[PDB]
Amino acid sequence: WTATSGSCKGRCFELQEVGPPDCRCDNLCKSYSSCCHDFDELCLKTARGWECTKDRCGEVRNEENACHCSEDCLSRGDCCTNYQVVCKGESHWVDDDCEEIKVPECPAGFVRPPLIIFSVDGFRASYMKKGSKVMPNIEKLRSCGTHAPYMRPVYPTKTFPNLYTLATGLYPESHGIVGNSMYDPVFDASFHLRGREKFNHRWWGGQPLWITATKQGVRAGTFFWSVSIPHERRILTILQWLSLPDNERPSVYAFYSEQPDFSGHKYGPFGPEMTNPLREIDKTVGQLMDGLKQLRLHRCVNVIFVGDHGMEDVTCDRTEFLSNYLTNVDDITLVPGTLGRIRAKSINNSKYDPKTIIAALTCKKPDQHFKPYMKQHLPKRLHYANNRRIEDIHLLVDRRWHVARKPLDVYKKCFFQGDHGFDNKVNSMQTVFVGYGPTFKYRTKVPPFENIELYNVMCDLLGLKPAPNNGTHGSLNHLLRTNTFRPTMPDEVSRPNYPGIMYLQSEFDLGCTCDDKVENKLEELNKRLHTKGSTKERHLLYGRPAVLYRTSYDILYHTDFESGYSEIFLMPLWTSYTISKQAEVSSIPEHLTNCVRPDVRVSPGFSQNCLAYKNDKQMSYGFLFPPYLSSSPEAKYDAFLVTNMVPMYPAFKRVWAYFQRVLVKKYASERNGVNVISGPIFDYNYDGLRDTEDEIKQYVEGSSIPVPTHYYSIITSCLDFTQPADKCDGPLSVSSFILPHRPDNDESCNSSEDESKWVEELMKMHTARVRDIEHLTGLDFYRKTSRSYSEILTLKTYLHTYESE
Ligand SMILES: *[C@@H]1O[C@H](CO)[C@@H](O[C@@H]2O[C@H](CO)[C@@H](O[C@@H]3O[C@H](CO[C@H]4O[C@H](CO)[C@@H](O)[C@H](O[C@H]5O[C@H](CO)[C@@H](O)[C@H](O)[C@@H]5O[C@H]5O[C@H](CO)[C@@H](O)[C@H](O)[C@@H]5O)[C@@H]4O)[C@@H](O)[C@H](O[C@H]4O[C@H](CO)[C@@H](O)[C@H](O)[C@@H]4O[C@H]4O[C@H](CO)[C@@H](O)[C@H](O)[C@@H]4O)[C@@H]3O)[C@H](O)[C@H]2NC(C)=O)[C@H](O)[C@H]1NC(C)=O
Ligand SMILES: CCCOc1ncc(-c2ccc(C(=O)NC)cc2[N+](=O)[O-])cc1C
Ligand SMILES: [Ca+2]
Ligand SMILES: [Ca+2]
Ligand SMILES: [Cl-]
Ligand SMILES: [K+]
Ligand code: NA
Ligand SMILES: [Zn+2]
Numbered sequence: 001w002t003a004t005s006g007s008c009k010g011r012c013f014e015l016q017e018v019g020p021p022d023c024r025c026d027n028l029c030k031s032y033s034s035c036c037h038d039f040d041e042l043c044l045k046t047a048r049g050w051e052c053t054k055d056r057c058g059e060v061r062n063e064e065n066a067c068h069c070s071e072d073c074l075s076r077g078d079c080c081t082n083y084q085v086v087c088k089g090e091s092h093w094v095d096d097d098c099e100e101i102k103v104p105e106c107p108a109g110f111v112r113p114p115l116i117i118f119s120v121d122g123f124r125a126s127y128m129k130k131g132s133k134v135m136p137n138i139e140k141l142r143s144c145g146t147h148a149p150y151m152r153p154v155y156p157t158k159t160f161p162n163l164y165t166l167a168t169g170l171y172p173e174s175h176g177i178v179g180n181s182m183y184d185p186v187f188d189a190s191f192h193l194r195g196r197e198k199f200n201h202r203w204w205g206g207q208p209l210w211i212t213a214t215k216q217g218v219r220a221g222t223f224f225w226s227v228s229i230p231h232e233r234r235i236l237t238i239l240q241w242l243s244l245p246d247n248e249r250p251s252v253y254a255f256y257s258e259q260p261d262f263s264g265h266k267y268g269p270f271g272p273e274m275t276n277p278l279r280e281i282d283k284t285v286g287q288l289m290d291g292l293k294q295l296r297l298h299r300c301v302n303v304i305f306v307g308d309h310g311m312e313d314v315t316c317d318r319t320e321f322l323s324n325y326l327t328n329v330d331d332i333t334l335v336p337g338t339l340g341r342i343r344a345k346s347i348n349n350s351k352y353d354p355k356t357i358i359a360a361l362t363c364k365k366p367d368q369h370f371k372p373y374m375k376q377h378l379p380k381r382l383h384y385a386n387n388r389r390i391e392d393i394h395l396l397v398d399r400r401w402h403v404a405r406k407p408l409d410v411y412k413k414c415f416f417q418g419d420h421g422f423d424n425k426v427n428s429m430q431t432v433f434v435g436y437g438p439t440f441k442y443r444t445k446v447p448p449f450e451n452i453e454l455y456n457v458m459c460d461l462l463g464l465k466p467a468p469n470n471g472t473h474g475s476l477n478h479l480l481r482t483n484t485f486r487p488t489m490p491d492e493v494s495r496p497n498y499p500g501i502m503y504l505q506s507e508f509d510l511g512c513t514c515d516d517k518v519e520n521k522l523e524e525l526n527k528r529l530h531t532k533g534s535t536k537e538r539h540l541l542y543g544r545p546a547v548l549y550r551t552s553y554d555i556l557y558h559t560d561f562e563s564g565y566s567e568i569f570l571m572p573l574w575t576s577y578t579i580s581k582q583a584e585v586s587s588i589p590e591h592l593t594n595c596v597r598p599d600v601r602v603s604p605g606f607s608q609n610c611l612a613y614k615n616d617k618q619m620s621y622g623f624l625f626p627p628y629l630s631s632s633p634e635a636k637y638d639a640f641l642v643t644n645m646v647p648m649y650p651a652f653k654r655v656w657a658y659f660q661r662v663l664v665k666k667y668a669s670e671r672n673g674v675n676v677i678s679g680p681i682f683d684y685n686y687d688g689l690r691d692t693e694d695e696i697k698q699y700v701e702g703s704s705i706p707v708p709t710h711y712y713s714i715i716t717s718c719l720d721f722t723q724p725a726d727k728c729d730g731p732l733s734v735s736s737f738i739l740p741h742r743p744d745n746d747e748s749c750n751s752s753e754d755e756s757k758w759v760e761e762l763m764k765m766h767t768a769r770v771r772d773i774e775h776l777t778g779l780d781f782y783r784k785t786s787r788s789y790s791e792i793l794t795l796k797t798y799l800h801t802y803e804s805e
Helices: 039-043 083-088 136-144 159-168 209-215 231-241 261-267 272-294 354-360 451-462 521-532 610-615 635-640 650-671 759-765 770-777 789-797
Strands: 115-120 182-184 189-191 252-257 302-307 319-321 332-335 339-344 370-374 393-397 402-404 433-436 553-557 562-566 571-579 620-623 645-648 674-681 710-718 732-740
Touching: 083 272, 115 159, 115 272, 115 451, 136 272, 136 302, 136 433, 159 209, 159 451, 209 252, 209 451, 231 252, 231 272, 252 272, 261 272, 302 451, 354 370, 354 393, 393 402, 521 553, 571 645, 571 650, 620 650, 645 650, 650 674, 650 710, 650 732, 650 759, 674 770, 710 770, 732 759, 732 770, 770 789
Parallel strands: 115 252, 115 302, 319 402
Antiparallel strands: 182 189, 302 433, 332 339, 339 393, 370 393, 553 562, 562 571, 571 674, 620 645, 674 710, 710 732
């Protein structure tokens, strides 16, 4: 019930929300059907339009007008945005030459530069170049302020997931808004774009910027606008709030625009009908900037121009139907569109089986335009699994396509020419970032970054302390003139042991053999110094990684490679080696094919054994440092040490062997040498965090050798590839992957072909940030470089996407 009989007289767009059943006048009252009777009349005036004309100049104040051209309007803070241009011979903001803003130039009373977030739905990254002729305001913001070629949204590339990520710094799996449409098994409730349930506070986790600000004593304008409030009214409202007395005036504001997304759904991302929407957005920007300039706030305010996702071409004829794959199509519910989410229609059906559903959706048609996944098998870079609201079965849909249940769902619902929601590495999904103001840099391009990073910066811009989030704080310092947050390296928790020769061959009963029984003063001093660390400067280029948890491990040195060996997991946590441009691939000689050697530095009780692998019919084994790249026939023996061994499914061995034998050498040639750090990952509870011992769901049969869920590699070289990896003087260049450790290659539909036809494709899909690898291993890389910590932070958050230009 709402008792809509109160009034909005002097309450228009009140900042505090009044409690039911009293009537409301907040910018969200229309969406709850709870505005006072006189809201439209008093608060949504439209009389005479949005612009001053020559004849309105110096007029008599008529309170009915939407905005004013009277003499007293500047004091009232309620002029039309063009008042000074029309009536005082001033010029539009866009027509002024841009001058650097070395310091905030604010009116007296301002405790800090305010922040305006200008959000534009569906603003594809390419619109910046492709629409530059029709967006002079936006283009001035971009070229005078700080900008990125594009900003990467989060998956799923939808509105609410992305706007709430901006607001919180969190992955959707952590903030809860994991789609535009959701079911929560625990609440037994559903979340839709239409309706009431989307307003209930239990869906929304984390701590959004407006709450972060309020708790720390910074006042916030209300971020949301009811859909029927015209854009011009939103701008005038923000401008009005900026005129308030120092004690009531907010420090952070938000504007949202439904365009260009609304039009892009109808016309496609580049429909000729798209030029007008891009013009209107620019005009709106102009109005804001002209309004700020009237109030002397245009060299005081920080403006963030930001999109939620891009837009792709999608039509009805490009829809795949699950009814062409499944018989039991009515025992299932599907969340449809640019992503698939399948669950049972009824929990009382005990015959429904996810296993056979996946199988039935796997590589069934030669051109298939979606791929089924158990959520835990989705690429780790998507961070899309650890939430009860994400269904166990997910369909990653090809760019340009749709997935629906039955064909009736499509025609009983062609309407659209555009859509979005695909994998967030897809070019057409990229969106924009521009920052303009005294705290941002002047005329500066920065590299592409991810939207999870903005929350921290917005907090820096406001003098706030961020709530714990998934940004990496300091990784976007290069955006800022000042107010930079100065981060320290996390402290190492566990210090390594450095074991020497402590055990005799005969103490090992591992069930391993090696043909290593063939027999000098010059060359024996040489191997000693290698096992103490004479080549360590060569293979450990950026320091040893720090172990940020409590554990027991050993550093092991060798001619060709260095490792941190875990006595708890019985394998290395990491192995580090450098392959230079000139290095040569060799084979595994016949006599050493099944050779596994005891490591005399590590006790039998902390080693694996061959018998476990013999007795396990499913599991085989592999090596972290590849024997193929041994520097000499003698060094090659080191690669067969039981401490270099890790568990591998024969299906995964095909992947790993091709990566080690072919791809490593390929990258060394292309990149002028590479440093490689490789290791196992354990994430049985799919939270993106390193599992402790008691979380491991699978061991090698009849042993305590734990099975990794993934294998990573970090490949580093010099950004200036004229300098070889091992002698680099400048910035570094990195790419990484987190390969799922799977007993079959069902994910790659071409896996019965030669490895050169599918392997590198799989690796690309599983590309990763070093930071992803850090969360999953509890290690901290790049501890000793000649580079600044902020710059390293940026490097760690880099993602190599393999998307073209
Ligand atoms: C990205 O960044 C985020 C933010 O930093 C990272 O997530 C954090 O990770 C922490 C570790 O996983 C986690 O800490 C836990 O806190 C638990 C209490 O949680 C409440 O309080 C927080 C803080 O205010 C709040 O944010 C939470 O809100 C969640 O839950 C509701 C729904 O229930 C949602 O509204 C909201 O969206 C959010 O959901 C998300 O997070 C939770 C994780 O808590 C997930 O379950 C959801 O799927 C969703 O993703 C909560 O209101 C606390 O209970 C935990 O403590 C247990 O474990 C410790 C280990 O130290 C142990 O000592 C304790 O015994 C305890 O175990 C007991 O309970 C167990 C389970 O019932 C049981 O098995 C045991 O036997 C014990 O009885 C834990 O310390 C922190 O909450 C989240 N924060 C957020 C916002 O998600 C994230 O890791 C980052 N991602 C990456 C990849 O780096
Ligand atoms: C810094 C990000 C601010 O966070 C947000 N900003 C705007 C919205 C929002 C979403 C949809 C619509 C709409 O009209 N859809 C038809 C309107 C608004 N709105 O006006 O607020 C949501 C959020 C979380
Ligand atoms: Ca959107
Ligand atoms: Ca985990
Ligand atoms: Cl969705
Ligand atoms: K085996
Ligand atoms: Na296959
Ligand atoms: Zn949309």
